[PDB]
Design an enzyme around this catalytic site. Structure first.
Site, mmCIF file in Angstrom:
data_model
loop_
_atom_site.group_PDB
_atom_site.id
_atom_site.type_symbol
_atom_site.label_atom_id
_atom_site.label_comp_id
_atom_site.label_asym_id
_atom_site.label_seq_id
_atom_site.Cartn_x
_atom_site.Cartn_y
_atom_site.Cartn_z
ATOM 1 N N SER A 149 32.954 5.739 32.352
ATOM 2 C CA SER A 149 33.346 4.336 32.459
ATOM 3 C C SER A 149 32.380 3.498 33.298
ATOM 4 O O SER A 149 32.491 2.259 33.287
ATOM 5 C CB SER A 149 34.752 4.212 33.059
ATOM 6 O OG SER A 149 35.753 4.749 32.225
HETATM 7 C C1 LIG Z 1 35.998 6.023 32.601
HETATM 8 O O1 LIG Z 1 35.336 6.961 33.017
HETATM 9 N N1 LIG Z 1 37.318 6.232 32.012
HETATM 10 C C2 LIG Z 1 38.065 5.057 31.606
HETATM 11 C C3 LIG Z 1 39.253 5.100 32.622
HETATM 12 N N2 LIG Z 1 38.717 4.709 33.920
HETATM 13 O O2 LIG Z 1 37.925 5.665 34.507
HETATM 14 S S1 LIG Z 1 38.072 5.603 36.006
HETATM 15 O O3 LIG Z 1 39.529 5.603 36.398
HETATM 16 O O4 LIG Z 1 37.258 6.722 36.692
HETATM 17 O O5 LIG Z 1 37.402 4.368 36.531
HETATM 18 C C4 LIG Z 1 39.962 6.411 32.783
HETATM 19 C C5 LIG Z 1 39.070 7.641 32.879
HETATM 20 C C6 LIG Z 1 37.794 7.576 32.033
HETATM 21 C C7 LIG Z 1 38.099 8.217 30.687
HETATM 22 N N3 LIG Z 1 37.297 9.326 30.259
HETATM 23 O O6 LIG Z 1 39.022 7.797 30.004
#
Ligand SMILES: *C(=O)N1C[C@H](NOS(=O)(=O)O)CC[C@H]1C(N)=O
Length: 227
Positions: A53
């Site tokens: 993300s």
């Molecule tokens: C990003 O890595 N994602 C989108 C969402 N936010 O990530 S975070 O909470 O670390 O900022 C959830 C986890 C992740 C994903 N693989 O869905």
């Protein structure tokens, strides 16, 4: 791959292994006023991993640059890391625009794969050292993206603000076989005397985005950035 390009900077080698504890990874920082990089674990810092993300930083700039994001808004989407918002931006950007941007930005291996969620444990990969260089350059040197767009991105990345400092950043968490696989925190800090770009990556142990954020805060505090 691995990021092999030499750093022509007299960078400081750090030892923050104690703060990392059971976790494996790296930490990179860059001071604007000193024009100086600081690196814990340079070897790991050059290994390329999925950005997860943290790539929403660039999807946001693309969305603003192409007026997909106009006038659930950017701030709520970024702070809660709402996936559909950024997958939709990607879907609405032509591939060659993205390829052109990643080349001009020098974003990792530039590998767009199927051009669908390519940033989520898939084709696109970037090293922790590159995360700092690329983010710093995009905000401070790139003149294609407007200052309006940059300010809107920054407002969406604001995490902490007080009389001593302003902390901005984005976490990322990769999941494989039902468990943490990949933890990121990428951002920058504005103090009364300097501006620092930084990133923490976790490769093993408990490699969550939240763990990367907590280690980031401990390091910046210990190094006096938050004083
Ligand atoms: C990003 O890595 N994602 C989108 C969402 N936010 O990530 S975070 O909470 O670390 O900022 C959830 C986890 C992740 C994903 N693989 O869905």
């Amino acid at each position: 791959y691995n990021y092999k390009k030499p750093l022509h900077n007299d960078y400081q080698i750090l030892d923050k292994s104690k703060i990392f504890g059971s976790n494996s990874g790296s930490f990179v920082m860059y001071s604007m006023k000193k024009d100086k990089y600081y690196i814990y674990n340079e070897k790991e810092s050059r290994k390329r991993y999925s950005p997860n993300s943290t790539y929403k930083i660039y999807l946001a700039m693309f969305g603003l640059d192409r007026h997909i994001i106009n006038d659930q808004d950017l701030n709520t989407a970024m702070q809660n890391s709402v996936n559909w918002y950024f997958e939709r931006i990607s879907d609405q950007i032509p591939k060659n625009y993205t390829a052109t941007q990643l080349k001009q930005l020098n974003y990792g291996n530039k590998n767009l794969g199927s051009y669908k969620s390519y940033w989520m444990e898939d084709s696109l990969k970037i090293s922790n050292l590159e995360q700092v260089i690329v983010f710093k350059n995009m905000m401070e040197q790139n003149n294609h993206f407007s200052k309006k767009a940059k300010n809107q991105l920054s407002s969406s990345l604001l995490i902490k603000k007080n009389e001593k400092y302003e902390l901005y950043g984005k976490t990322g968490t990769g999941i494989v076989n039902g468990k943490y696989n990949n933890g990121w925190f990428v951002g920058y800090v504005i103090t009364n005397h300097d501006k620092y770009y930084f990133a923490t990556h976790l490769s093993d142990g408990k490699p969550s985005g939240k763990n990367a954020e907590l280690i980031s805060e401990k390091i910046l505090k210990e190094m006096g950035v938050l004083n």
